[PDB]
Each structure stands twice: as C-alpha cells, then as structure tokens.
Write a protein that binds this ligand. Structure first.
Ligand SMILES: *[C@@H]1O[C@H](CO)[C@@H](O[C@@H]2O[C@H](CO)[C@@H](O[C@@H]3O[C@H](CO[C@H]4O[C@H](CO[C@H]5O[C@H](CO)[C@@H](O)[C@H](O)[C@@H]5O)[C@@H](O)[C@H](O[C@H]5O[C@H](CO)[C@@H](O)[C@H](O)[C@@H]5O[C@H]5O[C@H](CO)[C@@H](O)[C@H](O)[C@@H]5O)[C@@H]4O)[C@@H](O)[C@H](O[C@H]4O[C@H](CO)[C@@H](O)[C@H](O)[C@@H]4O[C@H]4O[C@H](CO)[C@@H](O)[C@H](O)[C@@H]4O[C@H]4O[C@H](CO)[C@@H](O)[C@H](O)[C@@H]4O)[C@@H]3O)[C@H](O)[C@H]2NC(C)=O)[C@H](O)[C@H]1NC(C)=O
Ligand SMILES: *[C@@H]1O[C@H](CO)[C@@H](O[C@@H]2O[C@H](CO)[C@@H](O[C@@H]3O[C@H](CO[C@H]4O[C@H](CO[C@H]5O[C@H](CO)[C@@H](O)[C@H](O)[C@@H]5O)[C@@H](O)[C@H](O[C@H]5O[C@H](CO)[C@@H](O)[C@H](O)[C@@H]5O)[C@@H]4O)[C@@H](O)[C@H](O[C@H]4O[C@H](CO)[C@@H](O)[C@H](O)[C@@H]4O)[C@@H]3O)[C@H](O)[C@H]2NC(C)=O)[C@H](O)[C@H]1NC(C)=O
Ligand SMILES: *[C@@H]1O[C@H](CO)[C@@H](O[C@@H]2O[C@H](CO)[C@@H](O[C@@H]3O[C@H](CO)[C@@H](O)[C@H](O[C@H]4O[C@H](CO)[C@@H](O)[C@H](O)[C@@H]4O)[C@@H]3O)[C@H](O)[C@H]2NC(C)=O)[C@H](O)[C@H]1NC(C)=O
Ligand SMILES: *[C@@H]1O[C@H](CO)[C@@H](O[C@@H]2O[C@H](CO)[C@@H](O)[C@H](O)[C@H]2NC(C)=O)[C@H](O)[C@H]1NC(C)=O
Ligand SMILES: *[C@@H]1O[C@H](CO)[C@@H](O[C@@H]2O[C@H](CO)[C@@H](O)[C@H](O)[C@H]2NC(C)=O)[C@H](O)[C@H]1NC(C)=O
Ligand SMILES: *[C@@H]1O[C@H](CO)[C@@H](O)[C@H](O)[C@H]1NC(C)=O
Ligand SMILES: *[C@@H]1O[C@H](CO)[C@@H](O)[C@H](O)[C@H]1NC(C)=O
Lengths: 42, 227, 52, 208
C-alpha cells in the first residue's frame, strides 16, 4: 500500500517454512495475517 | 491569459549548483501550486517536485537530498536549485501550474482517499546542458563523389557543443541542400554531415566550397570539395 | 445495522500433507479498507431515548 | 512502442502496469518539439478545449491496463502520449510511464535514398576512419541501420541519428561507423544495410 504511517500496518505479509506432503522437503510459502493474530519477538 | 517563461544558465559544470527561474505572468504565485518537470532527450518526463506558497512542498525521493525549491511572492516567480549536478541532470526543465484533485474510492472518514495532481498550463521551457567538457574545434573532411546526377557533400566530425551552421559557396547555391542532424558519439562529441544534389555535368568546376561555422570555438572552415 | 468486510480476499490452499491442507489468505484484490458497521443515527437516538 | 491507425478509424493506447487498485489515470500528449499538454485527467474527464474523441478507461477496473481511446483518428493526433498512474496500492509515481507514438498511415510509400561514403583521405592521415551512411527521401520516419563487415555484422561503433522530416515528406537519418585505418584495410568490403518498412536496401564500399 501507500501509507503515511497512521494506518499502523494492521495486515502483515508473512513468509515462512512449511512441511510438505513428503517428510524431506521444506516449503517456502507466504500468507496473510492480521496484527491481532501475530506477535514479534525480540 | 497565463504566460510562463523559464530562464536559466544553459551550461553547468559538474558538482555545482544549478539555478533556474520561472517568470510567472497573468496570475499570482501565492494562489496556485507550482511544479518542475525535466525531460532527457529521448526519455519520458521525470517529475522533480511541487511547491506551494504557504510552505507546503514535496520533492522527488530519488532527487530528495539534492533539490531545493522556493517561491518569491515579492517578484512573483519560481526558483529551482539543484546541488551536486552530473551528466544525468542534462535535460529540458519545464515550469508548470498545478491543480489538485481528490480521488475517493472507499469511506472518506477512514481516509482511503488520495490526492492527485495534474499540470494544465505549461511553459516554453529552458534547455540545460550539464556537461563538463571544454570546447573543441570541429574537423572538416570533404566527401568526394563515388561512382545524369551526382552527390557531393562535407563532413563535420568531432565537435562540441551544438550547433554548427553549414552553408555552400557563402549562400550562392541554396537548392538541393540537405543538412542532417548531428549525432552524439560515446566520446561526448557530435558529428554531422551535409550533402547536395549536383549535376554530373560540372566539368567546368566553378568553385564549390561549403562554409562551416562553429561559434563556441569561433571556428569558420571553408573546404573545397574535389573528386 | 449493517456490517461489511471491504477487503475482497483470496484463499490459498497450501498443502501441509499428506491429506491435511491449510487455508491461507492470498493477496487482496482491490483497495485496502477496514471492516465497519453502520447504525441508523435516527433509530439509535430514539431507541436510546426510550431506554433512558 | 508504436501504434499505426488509418485516418478516421479508432486508435488505442496502452501505458503503465496492470491496475492493482482504484486508479486515477492522467493522460498527456506531447507534440514533437513542444511541451506536453493535458488531455484526460481522472480516468475519463476531459477539460475545456479537448474533443470528446478522446476517452479513457475507467479507473474502477482491477487487473487491466490503462487504455486511451481516440476516435476519428486524424493526422493532427500524431504525437507522443504519456500517462501518470495514481493507484491506491502503489506509492506516488514520480516518473511517467513509457509513452506511445501514434502513427497516421497516410502518404504511405516513399523509397529511401541511401548513399555510402568511404573515409576521406585526409581523415586517414589523422589516424581515424569513418563510414558515412546518408538516408533521405523516405516515409514514414522509421528505419533501422545494420552495418556489415564482409558478411559479418558490426556490433559496436555504430552511431545513428533519429529521423526528422523537412519541408518535403522526406525524412532525415545519418548512420556513422567509427573505425581505425587498420580495420578499414583489413576486411574486403563493408556494407550499409538499411531496413525501411518491409524492404532493405544494401550498398557496399571497397578500399583502393
Ligand atoms: C456505511 O456508511 C458509510 C458512510 O455513510 C458508507 O461509506 C460510503 O461508502 C461508499 C461505497 O462504499 C462510498 O461511495 C464512493 O463515493 C465516491 C464519491 O462519491 C461521491 O461524490 C460523487 C462526485 O462528487 C464529486 O463531484 C461533484 C461534481 O459532480 C462535486 O460537487 C463534489 O464536491 C465531488 O468533488 C457524487 O456523484 C456521489 O453522489 C452519489 O450518491 C448520491 C446519493 O448520495 C446519488 O444521488 C448520486 O447520483 C451519486 O450516485 C451515483 O450516480 C451515478 C449514477 O446515477 C454514478 O455514475 C455516480 O458515479 C454515482 O456513483 C457521492 O456524493 C465515488 O467516487 C465512488 O465510486 C467510484 O469508485 C468506485 C470504487 O473505485 C468505483 O467502483 C465506481 O465505479 C466509481 O468510480 C467511478 O467514479 C470515479 C470518480 O468519479 C471515477 O474515477 C471512475 O473512473 C468511475 O467513473 C467512471 O466509471 C463509471 C462506471 O460506471 C462511469 O459510470 C463513469 O461515467 C466514469 O466513466 C464510491 O461510490 C462513499 O463515499 C462512502 N461515504 C459516504 C459518506 O457515503 C458505507 O458504504 C456504509 N456501509 C454500509 C454497509 O451501508
Ligand atoms: C473479488 O476478488 C475475486 C478474486 O479474489 C474476483 O474473482 C473474479 O470473479 C469473476 C467472476 O466470478 C471472474 O470473472 C470470470 O473470469 C473467468 C476467467 O477469467 C480469466 O480467463 C479469461 C479466459 O477464460 C478462459 O481461458 C482461461 C485460460 O486462458 C481458462 O483458465 C478459463 O477457465 C477460461 O476457459 C481471460 O480472458 C481473463 O482475462 C481477461 O480479463 C482481464 C481483466 O480482468 C483483462 O486484463 C484480460 O486482457 C482479459 O480480457 C482472465 O484471465 C472468465 O472466464 C469469465 O468470463 C466469462 O464470464 C463473465 C461473467 O462472469 C462474462 O461477462 C464474460 O463475457 C465471459 O463469458 C469471467 O470474467 C474473475 O476471473 C475472478 N478473478 C480472479 C482473479 O480469479 C472478484 O471479481 C472480486 N470481486 C469484486 C466485486 O471485486
Ligand atoms: C501516498 O501517501 C503519501 C503519504 O506520505 C501521500 O502524500 C501526502 O499527501 C498529503 C495530502 O494528500 C500531504 O499532506 C499535505 O500537507 C500539507 C502541509 O505540509 C497541507 O498543506 C496539505 O493540505 C492540502 O491537501 C489536503 C488534502 O486533501 C486538503 O484537504 C487541504 O485543503 C490542502 O489542499 C496536505 O494536508 C502530505 O504532505 C503528503 N506526504 C508526502 C510525504 O508527500 C500521497 O498523496 C499518497 N498517494 C497515493 C496515490 O496514495
Ligand atoms: C527457511 O528454511 C531455510 C533453510 O532451508 C532457511 O535458510 C537458511 O537461513 C539461515 C538463517 O535463518 C541461514 O544461516 C542459512 O544459510 C540458510 N540456508 C540454508 C540453511 O541452507 C530460511 O531462512 C528459512 N526461512 C524462514 C525461517 O523464514
Ligand atoms: C442497511 O442496509 C439495508 C439494506 O441492505 C438498508 O435498507 C435500504 O434502505 C434504502 C433507503 O436508504 C432503500 O432504498 C432500500 O430499498 C433498503 N433495502 C432493503 C433491502 O430494504 C438500510 O437503510 C441500511 N441501514 C443502515 C443504517 O446502513
Ligand atoms: C510498516 O508500517 C509502519 C507504519 O507505522 C512502520 O512503523 C513500519 O516500520 C513498517 N514496516 C515495514 C516492514 O514496512
Ligand atoms: C438525538 O441525539 C442528540 C445527540 O446526538 C441529542 O442531543 C438529542 O436529544 C437526540 N434527540 C432525541 C429526540 O432524543
């Protein structure tokens, strides 16, 4: 988006590793989550 | 209405401070928005930034820390400043009025409405060349006819800067004359040509001489073309 | 009262596997707006005034 | 990019990326050698003085590119058109999108007059050589020059001007090839292949 900074993000575009159907291969997929659903550490 | 006239130096050394002035006529500088737009040769126009009298003013993020704009309400004109210039800033700078509009798509209370600007009244514009290079004299070479008509011309190679006025026999012959636009080489030097359609029956060889003049170097070269 | 979610959304069906699938929100199509609810000012004013 | 439309027909111009949100596209027309002028602001709102022949695609369509429709194409509409994208999903664009040139198909045929001059004898004494390729009497102004060393193409050293018409329909274009006196006496012959519209004229030159 094109935001001044008062929108406070709210929506987050998260990328992460994931387990596929097979045990061996990881999956680098992305999703969308609300700020109230996530929390940052450190 | 409304007449705008831009005015600047035209030539700037590198790492210097370019200064431009946009003379405004027909309206006041306080009751309107003002934008500067530069355009390189053969490129799309690049927005520099917009300025308002009250003190509202925003710049181009790419040229943010180099550009400075201001408005003189006493003389009613616009002034541009660009510190640390290079060869990339060589373009044609226009001054232009700016009208604002508001595009609403959602619920205005929650913001979600963005203001768009558009220029309606442009000026003639000023050309600004920011090239470091010193003045170089042109080198004239004859183009001899190569096997009822025949072609004959000259060659002006490696010169700077533009332009070069080319005549034939001090203007005695004005028909069949075709001067091509110059081309900027990678060296930073231009090179043009001028060819004339001449009768093959020129055995008499009444004197044929193209007159080349280059004012930035005060160089006037008269070359005689012979087969 | 009328409540809406302006953000028309995309479901992304990533497969954790083998037979188990997680549903993830894909990219938004359109504008980024927040959910909201409308209450008729007249209806609410009278309703509150009848309660008080 | 180039768009050629027969006079009186309908012209369409595409600029910028695909729409991601609600847009407010601003169109501009630039006549060669002049300053850019406003045509359509706010998707399809034309200001005073501009005919209704100019229409723009509405900025409520998501996933489509901005489209400028020009009905009743005339010779006067032949110019450069740039667009200013204002999307709610993208940051403020400080750079206009890549413009599009409108071509009016009339006066169609003119065979290009090419002429190839070898380097002069006086230039060779200055340790320099230059092949000159003059192209005139051609319409429309759209040619591409390809040089040849014997049968092998030349990659670098090619400097070509942009077409420019004079009083006549004829356009002007000169192609130069900077070489060294050693390169000139090297190959057997050099060629100047000029491609115009659908045909290609080739003239050669050999040392003495
Ligand atoms: C809870 O409560 C809140 C708060 O009440 C409420 O929030 C409201 O949400 C709605 C939608 O969610 C939101 O609506 C938006 O409003 C935008 C602005 O509309 C208003 O302004 C216009 C113009 O005003 C300007 O111009 C005036 C001069 O003309 C000038 O004087 C003004 O100062 C100002 O500068 C005005 O016309 C509108 O009036 C409408 O409503 C009246 C009733 O109140 C009605 O009588 C009018 O006729 C008019 O209704 C339509 O009329 C004709 C049909 O007869 C249409 O052709 C019109 O376009 C009107 O819609 C408002 O006062 C508005 O721009 C938004 O609509 C555009 O954007 C969406 C999203 O992108 C597009 O999908 C639309 O297609 C539309 O896009 C067109 O218009 C824009 C802008 O002009 C163009 O850039 C586009 O290219 C496109 O135009 C082209 O395409 C169309 C396609 O058909 C074509 O027809 C055109 O010819 C052209 O080619 C959008 O509607 C509202 O602002 C917001 N707030 C309030 C207070 O209401 C929640 O929704 C509530 N929630 C619930 C659940 O209840
Ligand atoms: C909310 O968001 C959602 C998404 O999150 C969005 O979903 C849209 O829903 C609408 C309605 O259900 C969809 O509209 C339909 O799309 C069909 C497929 O569209 C694509 O395929 C077109 C070709 O179809 C064939 O070919 C492909 C392979 O090429 C094949 O897979 C198909 O199965 C089919 O065989 C293709 O032309 C089209 O692209 C066109 O449109 C874009 C602009 O959107 C333009 O830029 C392109 O140049 C091109 O013109 C697209 O890629 C389509 O078949 C279908 O069309 C018929 O039905 C409509 C009626 O619904 C008729 O009016 C029409 O004449 C056809 O008969 C229809 O268009 C849309 O695709 C969904 N979008 C996405 C991204 O999936 C909602 O719209 C959002 N809602 C709101 C309110 O915003
Ligand atoms: C993308 O987001 C940026 C946010 O940085 C946004 O640019 C901002 O635009 C607003 C206006 O929309 C600017 O705020 C201005 O501030 C000055 C004072 O410095 C005021 O004088 C301006 O007031 C005028 O505009 C108001 C807006 O309608 C009017 O209501 C009012 O009557 C005045 O006419 C205005 O408040 C802000 O300075 C910029 N910020 C930057 C960094 O440029 C941009 O518009 C957004 N673009 C899109 C396409 O979403
Ligand atoms: C997803 O997993 C991959 C491993 O396959 C991560 O890539 C490594 O990241 C670490 C730091 O986090 C680096 O030191 C390694 O060099 C990376 N490559 C390897 C191990 O091959 C990736 O960062 C993960 N993505 C996340 C956690 O978002
Ligand atoms: C909530 O929504 C309903 C309908 O979704 C609104 O009822 C409409 O009211 C308008 C008058 O403004 C009528 O023209 C429509 O016919 C009504 N629709 C129906 C289905 O009856 C109602 O006004 C809305 N209320 C609020 C507070 O937003
Ligand atoms: C997201 O936007 C917020 C707005 O306040 C800002 O503080 C934050 O730094 C931004 N983060 C990223 C990753 O863009
Ligand atoms: C309506 O609400 C206003 C405050 O929003 C209040 O002052 C007024 O008394 C209310 N009207 C009635 C009839 O209760």
């Amino acid at each position: 988006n094109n935001i001044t900074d008062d929108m406070r993000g709210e929506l987050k575009n998260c990328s992460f590793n994931m387990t596929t159907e097979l045990r061996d291969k990881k999956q680098k997929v992305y999703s969308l989550f609300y700020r109230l659903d996530v929390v940052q550490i450190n | 209405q409304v007449h705008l006239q831009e005015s600047g130096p035209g030539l700037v050394k590198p790492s210097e401070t370019l200064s431009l002035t946009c003379q405004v006529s027909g309206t006041l500088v306080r009751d309107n928005y003002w934008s500067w737009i530069r355009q390189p040769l053969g490129k799309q126009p690049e927005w520099i930034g917009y300025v308002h009298d009250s003190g509202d003013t925003n710049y181009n993020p790419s040229l943010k820390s180099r550009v400075h704009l201001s408005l003189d309400k006493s003389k009613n004109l616009v002034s541009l400043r660009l510190t640390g210039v290079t060869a990339a800033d060589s373009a044609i700078y226009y001054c232009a009025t700016t009208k604002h509009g508001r595009r609403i798509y959602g619920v205005v209370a929650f913001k979600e409405w963005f203001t768009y600007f558009y220029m309606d009244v442009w000026g003639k514009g000023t050309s600004v060349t920011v090239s470091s290079a010193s003045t170089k004299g042109p080198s004239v070479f004859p183009l001899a006819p190569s096997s009822g008509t025949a072609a004959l011309g000259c060659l002006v190679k490696d010169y700077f800067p533009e332009p070069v006025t080319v005549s034939w026999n001090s203007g005695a012959l004005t028909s069949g004359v075709h001067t091509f636009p110059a081309v900027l080489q990678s060296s930073g030097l231009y090179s043009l040509s001028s060819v004339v359609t001449v009768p093959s029956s020129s055995l008499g060889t009444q004197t044929y001489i193209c007159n080349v003049n280059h004012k930035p170097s005060n160089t006037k070269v008269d070359k005689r073309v012979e087969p | 009262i009328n409540c809406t979610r302006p953000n028309n959304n995309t479901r992304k069906s990533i497969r954790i596997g083998p037979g188990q699938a997680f549903y993830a929100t894909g990219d938004i199509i359109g504008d980024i707006r927040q959910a909201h609810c409308n209450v008729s000012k007249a209806t609410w004013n009278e309703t509150l005034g009848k309660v008080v | 990019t180039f768009v050629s439309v027969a006079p009186g027909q309908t012209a369409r111009i595409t600029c910028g990326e695909e729409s991601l949100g609600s847009r407010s596209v601003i169109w501009y027309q630039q006549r060669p050698g002049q300053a850019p002028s406003l045509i359509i602001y706010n998707n399809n709102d034309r200001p005073s003085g501009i005919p209704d022949r100019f229409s723009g695609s509405p900025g409520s369509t998501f996933g489509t590119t901005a489209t400028l429709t020009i009905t009743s194409v005339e010779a006067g509409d032949e110019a450069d058109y740039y667009c200013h994208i204002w999307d709610s999903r993208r940051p403020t664009n400080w750079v206009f999108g890549e413009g599009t040139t409108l071509i009016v198909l009339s006066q169609p045929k003119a065979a290009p007059s090419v002429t190839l001059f070898p380097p002069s004898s006086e230039e060779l004494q200055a340790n320099k050589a230059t092949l000159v390729c003059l192209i005139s009497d051609f319409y429309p102004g759209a040619v591409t020059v390809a040089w040849k060393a014997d049968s092998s193409p030349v990659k670098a050293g090619v400097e070509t001007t942009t077409p420019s018409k004079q009083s006549n329909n004829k356009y002007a274009a000169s192609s130069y090839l900077s070489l060294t006196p050693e390169q000139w006496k090297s190959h057997k012959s050099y060629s100047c292949q000029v491609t115009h519209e659908g045909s290609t004229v080739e003239k050669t030159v050999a040392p003495t």
